[model samples]
Target: EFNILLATDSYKVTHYKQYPPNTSKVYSYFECREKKYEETVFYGLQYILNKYLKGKVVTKEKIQEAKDVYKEHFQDDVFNEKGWNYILEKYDGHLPIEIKAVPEGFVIPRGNVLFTVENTDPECYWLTNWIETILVQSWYPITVATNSREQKKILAKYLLETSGNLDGLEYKLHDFGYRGVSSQETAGIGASAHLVNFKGTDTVAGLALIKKYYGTKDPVPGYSVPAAEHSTITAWGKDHEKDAFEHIVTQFSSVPVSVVSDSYDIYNACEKIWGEDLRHLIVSRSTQAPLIIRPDSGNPLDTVLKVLEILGKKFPVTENSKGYKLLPPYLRVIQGDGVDINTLQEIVEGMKQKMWSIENIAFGSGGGLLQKLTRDLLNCSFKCSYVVTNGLGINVFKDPVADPNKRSKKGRLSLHRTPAGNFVTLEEGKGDLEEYGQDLLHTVFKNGKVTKSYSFDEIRKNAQLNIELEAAH
Candidate 1:
């Protein structure tokens, strides 16, 4: 539980006095003004709405605290005590605001309106952008979702090119970013965003978050296999390194498991321990599950190829329809080090050049998956576009002479899907016209009530990619 009054910037406490006289309403829109990936995935607003902004969020104590704090900080009485009291009496501590956004998981091009906020009551016009600090944080989950989506596109392209199908694509990229994020909430939100595209994860916070907010009671939206870390193997001592590999393989034989092989010479572990000593144990489980070899250090492309080459020599290698060699089903490699979109693509391309099928490898990403981003990654911004002063509706905008990229849109905006299957923003309510097709932005929240709720499965389907394939000649 957070104090809504204290959640905003200190400057916002004094903004009520800055607006024009007799201001009746303020309308603002959230958007990605530039492209880091050409498209943005609209997500995590439901979590934000349900978690922070919904229900009776304001209270008399909160208002008093803000007043006291502002009095001390500013050395004067600048806090909007009257406005706070008005909201408390009129709306019963519920925010008098309306929120509209595209459906969760909808993919739209950059530079389009993703969501909009406005004050429902004329007296609370200042409340609209007052919450901008929290609402703008939507960039975190949206960026994570978009980053994961773009990575999926790369995996799908190579998988279809070499493997001839997308079987097990969901498990190709595992979330190893739990320990790499800043906080528990970040891990949960970022892992859930990645899970929107894939079903594999090692982050428990992601599963708990989706179950709590996304209407999944089953507790297993994302899953992981029994995997080992460096500490688990290193603790066994270098002399017993082979014994560590044998212990994990024999212990979790009934299920698919992954063991980090680079603790002490990844090559020796892959060739001697896994390929020779425990070869029978792994090969025998071919019908049941796989033994995933994870390389956590070194150059991903070079290391993965060497491991694959070694494993192919030991295991029964077969040729796929595309003339690429495939490792036996019982053995595979997962490169969990230094993996991002560019490196991931390079590894896949490198494997293809070596006549190896993409099926023999999987990937895990830590900081690259969740922590390596910022609000400017997508140039996300929230700006005032429309307002009503003295009962007259006025269109507002900003065009900085120094930087035209800072120019904001004018008037109230509406989003619609054009007849040609493209998204267009209609200014000044032109989206009301029937020719613009249906307005894609739906009213999701109004006056502390959530009108639309999405399930985890629904979100997954909405964000699922449909890849077209070409035959290998």
Candidate 2:
């Protein structure tokens, strides 16, 4: 049942300071007298919870039955207990409630945690620490998902060229991790986030927890796709590539088909056999179907380019060619062979390096994006400071300190930038983080949950848009 919230407290569950769920609406408690305040801790807490309860609270159950639904509401950080006070003091009184965030897209550094937590509440400091894991878990998947999305975005274009633009190629994410990921839950939510940004996931069932907990929907017929072009070195006694793909296709061939080709030899299988009648047999006749190829073997970039070059030579675009370089554009070519953002970026950048358009590298990324610069020297770390153990606690917060490439703002905050503003820190701790801000970390929370109607498709589109925007700049 873990959701997108798994990565960030992503649920942004208001968290309780005490008996009240962090989601409780203080405004609704009295009948709207708080309109005067407009925006306050009480208001933020109230707004988050009220909205969720109005439309999203558990309905099949009774009112009293919902008493246990403390989370059905979100509470502010005003604690009347002991645990939270310890949290605020941990760092200095001005505890730097941090995100321990690894930038949105990059190679993760070694010797660093991707994210951490801290107390923003000055007095009830201890409460912050309790939420660290929640933040740690909730934050990563999205980072992973987004990075993956970027890879997929660029890769999709690449596929268009390689496949002779055969016709209709889409993408798919896979449980992928059941082998490479760290855990079962990670295999689930983490996968969902990856799917959110990458093409859609082939491991539909695996993302169930994410779907159910987050109330997400099946993303797309394309991404919903199963593995079609089965490969060598697959699992036994159960379904791996062959059964998973062929079986799913038998049921959903109304859509394009995706197959993993590298299990055997990329060139031979794709060019020599499975790829022979590719354009006509697969991309033809079918209203909305084309075959998608996934690579899983060595030197994916080199291998992929080699395959593309060979495919181009072998299946050169004809006068009536699909007019683009998709393995099947009219069909598929998404790369997942140990792909990460940097690797994917390299492929695209490789084009620039080689003076070619980066429009032909179908990507089926997983971990590279899911875990964000996991191997880089992380600039994100969290520290919580405590100020009060008794009543009237004032937990102080200092956002991340600023350095040129490594700096941060602290506290429950809002960041904004003028049109075309990029915080290029020229001095150490001298630049205004505010003016430097070009993007605001938008946080939307509901109930004790974060209510976001991010159909996987939307996330993918956003990913593409982000890259396009960045690329233009």
Candidate 3:
């Protein structure tokens, strides 16, 4: 539903005339110049390609629409009408460009070339950077994927230390960020990025996105259990609080469920109502599915530990191999309030100090997982690194005296693993041969068609961390 011509910034419309005369080719690369995490999990480029860039994107109607809009907006004749018509006639509406990128879900250190763009046809040299606006948006999925992966590292460390194993680690961090994001598209992309690290989610938009773009055939790409909210609990008067708890416990006893217990008092609900009154009913469930108790309000660390302490006394407790107490299989806690990367670490460390296993709890993040981020979170940049004019290939770059960090790479680039097995970006076409082994940057897209495609399962495999290596850190 998007007009490809109008997807770019207004300033880009005038760039065709600004480039040096006889400009035959333009090459650009996308990289995370600076990053919050040391490494980034590259993903979501396929979604952008399938949804926006592939197939017959340029058309006669679209060209005229863009021309009229730019004339009114700029109050001048800056639109590249001839250049666009060239594409429509020569390529039959297919863009004449090639994109080479590190495979989706490949984890690479920051400050490396994640992807590069170049115009395939000399006449369409200006087309490369013209689409920078849409391609640069790759930062969102890359950042979300990195953020989710870093959190996984933290959770894995605590789980190994306290639980003595990594079982159920995938479901430890659930995606509850559906309702707190900016828009439906934002929710879909952000949630799907988080899914690269976990299998638990409440965001159905993410599943549909993966199915359509990533070629996932599984009916449910992510899973969630029946859960309760505050309204369902508070609907019952204070005097009937016990009855309200009993209704859900009995109704959903056959499967795992989450009940928000912080409506009135978390302590009383966990101790007197769930612990004492409905204790036998929960304990005597036909299945081993846990009734996940959620604390939606109050200090996360103190509230989680206290709730676990209260539940420990009521339910039969067992200790893991590391001598950390584990709650009964039929009971657990989910802290959905005030959870971010910082607070999540604090809570996990606090549990370790209190001799509680990490298995006793799971986390649900809303804004912290999806909305609380920016493109600058990863310091992403898409810059013109190489260009050709009058059949002479030129090494284009920018090095500001004020900040060397803003410096850009020059000339055509190739990414490969060094002799020591570390990834490196060799500029100026130094990596054209097999001297550095095969280049990791494969041509994923060429001339408006996807040369290579990755599935959702493949991405998950590429993104999976080495648990042994992680624990050593």
**Highest-scoring model, lDDT:** 3
- 325-430 in candidate 1: lDDT tens per residue? 9988888888999999889999999999999998988999989999998998898999999999999999999999999888888898988877788898888766
Error of 1 at 104 (Å): 0.4
What Cα-based lDDT does every candidate model obtain? 0.89, 0.40, 0.91
lDDT of 2 by residue, 1-473 (tens): 22212222323233443323332111100111110111101001111122322233222232223223433443432222233223223532122233322222222222222222333344433334443444433334434544454445555555434333312233333335444567665566566555444445544544564444333445432245545433222542232434443454456566755666666466775675444633345445263565665667888667767766666655533322433343334444667777665676666555444433333444565555443334122222343322333343232334445533332322222233345642121122222454555333322332133333333434444444333454447
Candidate 3 lDDT over residue span 1-473, tens digit each: 58999999999999999999999899999999962488999999999988999989999999999999999999999899999999999999999999999999999988899999999999999999999999999999999999999999999999989988888899999999989999999999999999999998898899899988996657767999999988888899878888888998888878998999988999999999999998988887644588899998889999999999999888899998899999878788898898888899999999999999999889999999999989888889999999999989999999999999899998888888887878898898888766887778888889989999899999988998889446446
Worst 10 residues of 3 by lDDT: 464-473
| Clashing residue pairs for model 3 | none
How far is 40's C-alpha from truth in model 2 (Å)? 26
Lowest lDDT 10-mer window, candidate 1? Answer: 464-473
Query: Cα deviation of 473 in candidate 2 (Å)?
Result: 16
For every model shown, the clashing-pair count is 0, 90, 0
- C-alpha root-mean-square deviation, candidate 1: 2.1
